[PDB]
Amino acid sequence: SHMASMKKKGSVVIVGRINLSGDTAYAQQTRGEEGCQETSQTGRDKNQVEGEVQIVSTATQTFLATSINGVLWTVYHGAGTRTIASPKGPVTQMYTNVDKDLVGWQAPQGSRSLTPCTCGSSDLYLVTRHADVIPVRRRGDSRGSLLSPRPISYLKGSAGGPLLCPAGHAVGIFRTAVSTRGVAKAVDFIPVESLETTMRS
Ligand SMILES: C=C[C@@H]1C[C@]1(NC(=O)[C@@H]1C[C@@H]2CN1C(=O)[C@H](C(C)(C)C)NC(=O)O[C@@H]1C[C@H]1CCCCCc1nc3ccc(OC)cc3nc1O2)C(=O)NS(=O)(=O)C1CC1
Ligand SMILES: [Zn+2]
């Protein structure tokens, strides 16, 4: 302890994006490691934000955050209770729910939001932090199966990323991979209706 020397955790910092605006998905880095560490400390990020899916970092982890209905959502297991860096300084979470593994901040100016799905469709697509678009069959409210299994390395750092309907509506937020002996066959996600409930409380 000793209060005079106690440290503060830094802000979550946007360090890039998954670009989905064209015919090709690809990852873009907007901030390297030294700038990220500085921005984490001040909570002041003057970078212009664009797009729906951000790549975010703390001091110890890198993962995704997805804008839906003007809220930038990610996983509690990545972000904890942290603020996010913004042009005006650190921004406090608007939503925090450890039970859902969910947090949200006001979507950054410049971001674009995905629309919540209304199709009731079960043919889905998971966007990874490396900008891979993996097909996923919905198997329950919060479960989908990967049409082609991958090692868990392949999904590491994609928590907070979106599951999309063929149209491109947001169906959910990737939470955790279900694996056996290191191979991911299934995914757990936070369905968008759970977000929408949270957005009414
Ligand atoms: C491989 C990619 C994968 C998506 C990733 N998710 C995880 O690694 C989660 C985090 C943690 C364990 N995870 C797992 O995926 C494990 C693992 C063996 C690692 C594959 N699998 C697993 O549990 O399967 C069991 C069926 C589910 C039942 C148990 C699910 C419990 C979910 C969960 N809830 C809470 C609530 C509150 C918390 O407070 C701190 C913490 C939590 N942590 C949790 O799970 C990811 O990319 N992360 S990340 O981006 O690298 C990182 C920066 C954030
Ligand atoms: Zn839809």
Numbering used by the authors: 981 to 1181
Give verbatim lines from the article.
The HCV NS3/4A protease – a chymotrypsin-like serine protease – is a prime therapeutic target that cleaves four known sites along the virally encoded polyprotein. To elucidate the underlying mechanism by which chemically diverse inhibitors bind to the wild-type protease and drug-resistant variants, crystal structures were determined for 16 inhibitor-protease complexes.
Notably, MK-5172, though active against the other two variants, lost significant potency against A156T (A156T IC50 = 108 nM). A156T, the worst of the resistance mutations for MK-5172A, sterically clashed with the P2–P4 macrocycle and caused a large shift in the binding position away from the catalytic triad relative to its wild-type structure. Overall, analysis of the four crystal structures explains MK-5172's significantly retained potency against R155K and D168A as well as its loss of potency against the A156T variant due to the rigidity of the macrocycle. Similarly, vaniprevir and MK-5172 exhibit significantly lower potency against the A156T variant due to direct steric clashes, while danoprevir partially accommodates this steric burden by repacking against the mutated surface. However, drugs such as vaniprevir and MK-5172 containing P2–P4 cyclization likely select for the A156T variant due to the rigidity of their P2 moieties.
